[PDB]
């Protein structure tokens, strides 16, 4: 009571002489106020109403209005030109940091009538700036009018790296004790159980980066790939592919000449990918999807669409293995379609295994049960119809 | 007053409840995945961590805290023995 009532005349003097003042001056004013409040916390302990009470709600509204104005201003200043792209995120963070640095002492106060304004600053600044930056980076083109597809990949992955760079900062903000207290209060202020502030901005980031740019990337990669798979698809020698019998080198240790270019392209592309900063999950997804589509292309446009000999399957498997090596699994992985292709090529290798020649009889074929066969290669991922297709292709001379 | 813990028996009980939790979870996901209703999550699956989540976490936390108190006691005894040697 004593310290309250001795602050009272101080409050009177200042309020009579602070309600009209420069907002920029009001900044240093309120900072000195909260610094004296620190002082009266530690040095001369007092734990009642501070000088903040002088500032009328209208003054607080004018202040946060100037604040949101300066926020939007600095934002448009750092986001007005395309060349601002590659560093904006960082600066953006900095701005937020600055904003966080600027509001951190204001956030330090504990006065109740202002927690509302802390909500407003969280929404109309932090939520607002994050949403606006999300919209911008989502709808932005810092790239020249004339451009290449690889550049589209590049801007998408730089977008994604900006997404992750801002998203980790958003998560740190979420873990910030001030915003934590904000969320706890607002959950106790209304009937809500919100786990964060944004809860959508982060979700929008994740959805965009995991579906939109992910799928566009894999689509573009598939497109340029089929573009590079043009002549390799036209390879007809698979039938009459006589082994270059080299006693010193394994069978066809070098891939098809018409595919090495595609190999170098993919190598470059996935190299840019790996060198780019992505949440590992998305990289694994897109790499497995590229693996997936190349498995599909190989099994359909190559395997089923051509006759092969002993050396043909070896060459083709070698090509596939090189293409997959371009897409190295990170530390430890299998793949459904990879094991499927492996089962496939093992089946194809039945023609040149003159040991279990008993199963090539049409009546064990028509039997429909191939448990004995499936326990010869440990096949695990095939139906029975495709086995019939394979043995038909074998009997029909498609495999010499 | 030196805080005597003997986190051994508490670790034992926590491992007991832990294996119990683990087999309950195993049977639960067994009934769930082996759940013939591919479109309905079993109340057993949900109810596992609707009923044992906090127990599992507190038991695991108690296990780790007990093992860490024990291994701190252990490095303390080790340091005291080596300094004693």
């Amino acid at each position: 009571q004593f310290i309250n009532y001795v602050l009272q005349p101080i409050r009177d003097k200042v309020r009579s002489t602070l309600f009209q003042n420069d907002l920029k001056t009001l900044i240093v004013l309120i900072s000195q106020i909260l610094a004296t409040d620190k002082n009266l916390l530690n040095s001369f302990h007092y734990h009642g109403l501070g000088l903040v009470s002088l500032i009328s709600d209208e003054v607080w509204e004018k202040w946060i209005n100037y604040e949101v104005e300066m926020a939007n201003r600095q934002f448009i200043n750092i986001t007005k030109n395309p060349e601002d792209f590659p560093k904006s995120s960082q600066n953006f963070v900095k701005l937020i940091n600055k904003i966080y640095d600027y509001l951190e002492p204001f956030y330090d106060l504990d006065f109740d009538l202002l927690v509302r304004y802390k909500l407003m600053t969280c929404s109309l600044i932090f939520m607002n700036l994050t949403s606006s930056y999300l919209d911008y980076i989502l709808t932005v083109d810092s790239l020249n009018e004339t451009r290449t597809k690889e550049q589209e990949l590049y801007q998408t992955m730089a977008k994604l790296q900006h997404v992750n760079f801002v998203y980790r900062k958003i998560k740190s903000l979420s873990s910030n004790f001030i915003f934590i207290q904000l969320t706890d209060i607002v959950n106790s202020t209304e009937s809500k159980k919100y786990n964060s502030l944004f809860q959508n901005v982060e979700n929008d980031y994740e959805k965009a980066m995991s579906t939109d740019m992910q799928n566009s990337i894999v689509h573009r990669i598939q497109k340029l790939l089929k573009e590079t798979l043009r002549n390799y698809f036209k390879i007809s020698t698979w039938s009459t592919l006589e082994m270059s019998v080299d006693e010193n080198i394994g069978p066809s240790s070098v891939p098809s000449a018409e595919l090495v270019n595609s190999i170098n392209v993919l190598r470059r592309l996935i190299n840019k990918l790996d060198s780019m900063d992505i949440p590992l999950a998305i990289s694994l997804k897109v790499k497995n999807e590229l693996l997936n589509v190349i498995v599909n292309y190989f099994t359909e446009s190559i395997l089923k669409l051509n006759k092969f000999n002993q050396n043909g399957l070896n060459q083709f498997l070698h090509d596939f293995k090189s293409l997959s090596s371009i897409l190295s699994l990170p530390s430890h992985a299998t793949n459904y379609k990879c094991m499927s292709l492996h089962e496939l090529v093992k089946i194809l290798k039945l023609k040149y295994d003159p040991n279990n020649q008993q199963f090539l009889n049409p009546e064990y074929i028509k039997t429909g049960n191939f448990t004995s066969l499936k326990e010869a290669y440990s096949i695990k991922y095939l139906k029975d119809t495709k086995i019939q297709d394979a043995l038909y292709r074998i009997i029909y001379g498609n495999i010499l | 007053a030196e805080t005597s813990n003997d986190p051994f028996l508490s670790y034992v009980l926590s491992s007991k409840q832990l294996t119990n939790l683990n087999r309950l979870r195993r049977k639960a996901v067994t009934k769930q995945l082996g759940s013939s209703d591919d479109n309905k999550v079993s109340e057993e699956f949900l109810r596992y961590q609707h009923t044992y989540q906090r127990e599992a976490f507190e038991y695991l936390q108690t296990k780790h805290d007990a093992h860490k108190i024990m291994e701190s006691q252990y490095e303390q005894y080790q340091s005291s023995s080596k300094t004693r040697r």
Binding site: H47, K193, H332, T334, Y336 | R25, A56, L60
Partner: protein
């Protein structure tokens, strides 16, 4: 030694439990009524917190990675991790597709992996709950401990006041 995602999960979880025991020790340290007769202890708490958030990002990351790995291991399986939009509700793992003709050994292996990952996602739900609980615990302890230091300074200044002079001539 290919380090399975579950192995990273258990190592990171074990580290996380180390950190939980440490920060809980810090909390119970500040729950001891200790006077300077704290600052770098607070700093260490912030550093350990940022460690918690780094490691929790790593944890959810490798967790998503393991989920993807599972999805691409088995063809017939369609799993989807739906993060609960509410604190009081656990996260969700809807197994959408599963063909019952898969190999029994691989079936049980997927069973054990699902078992471990469900344990992990739920333990992680409870872990996020627990770190929220312990940061609210720390901040509540800050509100109570600044107030208790207020009351201790008030009591010390009060007995100092009282021993100085209070009109003891009556």
């Amino acid at each position: 030694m290919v380090v399975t995602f579950l192995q990273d999960l258990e190592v990171l979880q074990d580290a996380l439990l180390n950190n939980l025991q440490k920060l809980s020790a810090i909390s119970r340290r500040k729950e001891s009524g200790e006077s300077k007769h704290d600052e770098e202890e607070e700093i260490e708490f912030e550093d350990l917190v940022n460690i918690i958030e780094s490691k929790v990002s790593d944890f959810e990351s490798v967790l998503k990675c393991s989920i993807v790995e599972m999805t691409y291991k088995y063809p017939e399986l369609k799993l989807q991790w739906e993060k609960s939009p509410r604190y009081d509700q656990c996260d969700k793992l809807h197994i959408v597709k599963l063909d019952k003709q898969m190999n029994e050994d691989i079936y049980a292996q997927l069973v054990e992996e699902l078992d471990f990952v469900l344990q992990f996602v739920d333990w992680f739900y409870c872990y996020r709950l627990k770190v929220k609980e312990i940061l609210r615990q720390h901040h509540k302890r800050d509100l109570a401990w600044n107030d208790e230091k207020r009351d201790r300074a008030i009591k010390f200044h009060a007995v100092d006041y009282d021993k100085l002079h209070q009109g003891t001539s009556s």
